[PDB]
Structure 1
Amino acid sequence: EIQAPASADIRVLRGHQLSITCLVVTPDDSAIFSAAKDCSIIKWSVESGRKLHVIPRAKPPGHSSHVLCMAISSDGKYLASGDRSKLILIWEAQSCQHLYTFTGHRDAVSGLAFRRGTHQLYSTSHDRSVKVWNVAENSYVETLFGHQDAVAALDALSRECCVTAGGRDGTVRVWKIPEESQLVFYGHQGSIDCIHLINEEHMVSGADDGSVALWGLSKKRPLALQREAHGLRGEPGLEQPFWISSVAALLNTDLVATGSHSSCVRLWQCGEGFRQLDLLCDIPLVGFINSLKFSSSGDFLVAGVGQEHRLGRWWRIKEARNSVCIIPLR
């Protein structure tokens, strides 16, 4: 089994001045990039917890508005960061040198993923579009349409395909790019706010009604759905579920992680055929869990925490720390 980590195990990296919005772990597991509502990007050493580089709020390169999303290529070469200025900035991940700025989105960039094994980048946006870029050639390829509202998130693995979470449109969409085809799955579970691939044929999503869903990429209804996955607050009969702010999966395994603002990160195991989600443990962690990523090794989980939700200022948890938390999974 996995030993349930406690506060005495969790390394809390401090330095962002406002809520963390997103992060990535480098493929080699040696570093973390995080971004926050302070508009900066920080590169951290996993091993020491020290800062390796800081890209400040921005004619030096950098972001003038919140970074909402980031992705790193599978060879570790490129970092992409997407912001509320409609921009995707591309960086040399080793040096943090700015390489390019992709323009073309008409509203905030809200999801990014590289196609594994390539330098092909997929983005999505509040402008309701999905875009395809080639980072090696600094080129724009094409735009795909279908979502009916601002898109919340995007993931991809090795196939020429991405999956998106439609937010208030209530859909998860599968974009089969060379096939010029689009599969639309209906969640019937409020706003679909986060998504992550588990393997090439399965994914996990989280919704603002508190539900966590497992999907097969070719079946139109969830294979599993865990209601109120982070529990409840409120009066008897009038309960309000904790909304799901982040989800992560450990590639090619049955391990999934979920985050809300319920004071814990939850680890789950997917049952045979992905037809059931079973809770493994609660990891104590106060605040908005705005980002979750497993290490490549699966030996640690990284959480991006904020006093506030990554998308707005509606709620503040004053007891939380705006931190990048390294959670060991032993």
Structure 2
Amino acid sequence: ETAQEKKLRLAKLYLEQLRQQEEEKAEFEEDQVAGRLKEDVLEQRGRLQKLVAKEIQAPASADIRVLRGHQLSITCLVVTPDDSAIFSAAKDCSIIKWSVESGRKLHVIPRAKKKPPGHSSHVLCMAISSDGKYLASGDRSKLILIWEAQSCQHLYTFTGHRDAVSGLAFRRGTHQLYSTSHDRSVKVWNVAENSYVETLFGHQDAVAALDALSRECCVTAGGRDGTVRVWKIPEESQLVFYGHQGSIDCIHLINEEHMVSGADDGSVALWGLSKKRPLALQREAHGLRGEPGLEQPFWISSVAALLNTDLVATGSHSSCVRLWQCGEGFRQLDLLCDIPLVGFINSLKFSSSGDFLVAGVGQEHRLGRWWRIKEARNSVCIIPLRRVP
């Protein structure tokens, strides 16, 4: 065990250096540093990882409300922080604002003709600020457009990406925006001061998804690259995780230290910062399809997790939306129930309160026309979640 002895001795030597740094950190100077540690511990206590999986019960099809106003398949959707309105976009290049309580259309942004502002190509991603003030949408025309959420008034048009924009997410509590594209670059945008900050590199293929939280940090899915990367912007560091096989299409953060991702080979994985490889791996989350001898698992199109809890929802074209439970330490994933819903689940977003789940249903996949489901309706479905102890 020569390799083990060298690794063990090297670990002992590394601990000596950390002791010297701790003494210098111990030396409002150090009092302010200790106050920062207290807030972080209290913040950790804020994310107490509340267990609400058992109280969730499967709803009924009659309870599910179906809003139909889009011409083509819905690609993405977001929920306003106040849980009052839903913004949705589709392949018809239009954006429609829906009222959660009534289901009527509040405002409709038409497709720009080839001069009212609008999108001339398919809209792939949308993000909304934590205060509900700003709305951002990305399209295939390498453009990012900013809208005033309350009035749907166009404000800014961000240029600079060299390919289609695929991911957008606002930093929670701020107006800082992170954007990614098929040009393998990640850019930083400050919406309030309508300025460009910097560009980050490191991905080797087209980026599929992006998510962020209150920390000055974001995660991205590598697609065909097969890697998921954590971007430490102030520290100027990049973490690389190697996990499940196949293209990684969708991702969602569970808390500040965990995330869930979905792949095109049916695998769903739970990740942790401590371990490079995924902690949990659920293979064939939505079953298998195909003729005998040519069977392949259903593609995972969207994933979602309820913030600071253990509830995970995965969407595919297997005509059902599945609810999952994260195990202790996020090491096990357990299926709760199946919500019958026919079509491609292109988007899944939990409400801020957690009382309902919004699913985007389209006849086709959000990235192409490889499948077309005639029985599916291009609609935004509000799935009510009822909690009884």
**TM-score higher than 0.5 here?**
yes
Q: CA deviation at 1:31?
A: 0.4
Q: CA deviation at 1:6?
A: 2.2
Q: CA deviation at 1:237?
A: 5.1
Question: CA–CA distance in 2 between the matches of 1:195 and 1:326?
Answer: 21
Q: CA deviation at 1:239?
A: 2.1
Given candidates 152, 155, 164, the residue that maps to 1:108 is 164
8 Å CA contact retained: 1:4, 1:283: yes
Q: SS at 2:77's partner residue? A: strand
Partner of 1:88: 144
Structure 1: tracts of 5 or more residues without a match: none
Q: CA deviation at 1:218?
A: 3.8
Question: CA–CA distance in 2 between the matches of 1:188 and 1:301?
Answer: 27
Partner of 1:285: 341
CA deviations over 1:104-123 (Å, ceiling 9, x no partner): 10000000000000000001
Q: CA deviation at 1:235?
A: 4.2
8 Å CA contact retained: 1:242, 1:262: yes
Question: CA–CA distance in 1 between the matches of 2:382 and 2:341?
Answer: 11
CA deviations over 1:47-81 (Å, ceiling 9, x no partner): 00000000010011110000000000000000000
Q: CA deviation at 1:236?
A: 4.7
8 Å CA contact retained: 1:121, 1:134: yes
Q: SS at 2:265's partner residue? A: coil
8 Å CA contact retained: 1:203, 1:217: no
Moved more, 217-226 or 306-315: 217-226
Moved more, 233-242 or 84-93: 233-242
8 Å CA contact retained: 1:124, 1:130: yes
Question: CA–CA distance in 1 between the matches of 2:269 and 2:184?
Answer: 22
Partner of 2:293: 237
CA deviations over 1:122-177 (Å, ceiling 9, x no partner): 01111111111000100111111111111000000000000001111111110000
Mapping for residues 129-208 of structure 1, pairs under 5 Å: 129-208=185-264
TM-score between the two structures when normalised by the length of structure 2: 0.84
> How many residue pairs are counted as aligned between the two chains?
329
Q: CA deviation at 1:193?
A: 0.4
Question: CA–CA distance in 2 between the matches of 1:38 and 1:260?
Answer: 21
CA deviations over 1:252-291 (Å, ceiling 9, x no partner): 0001100010001111010000000100110000000000
8 Å CA contact retained: 2:176, 2:190: yes
Question: CA–CA distance in 1 between the matches of 2:139 and 2:57?
Answer: 37
8 Å CA contact retained: 2:343, 2:362: yes
CA deviations over 1:204-254 (Å, ceiling 9, x no partner): 000000011100134211111100000101345542000100001100000
TM-score between the two structures when normalised by the length of structure 1: 0.98
8 Å CA contact retained: 2:355, 2:384: yes
Question: CA–CA distance in 1 between the matches of 2:253 and 2:150?
Answer: 26
8 Å CA contact retained: 2:320, 2:338: yes
Given candidates 46, 70, 76, the residue that maps to 1:22 is 76
Rg bigger for which structure? 2
Q: CA deviation at 1:7?
A: 1.3
**Deviation >6 Å, runs of 4+:** none
Identity of aligned residues (%): 100
CA deviations over 1:83-121 (Å, ceiling 9, x no partner): 000011000001000010100100000000000000000
Question: CA–CA distance in 2 between the matches of 1:98 and 1:321?
Answer: 29
Q: SS at 2:138's partner residue? A: strand
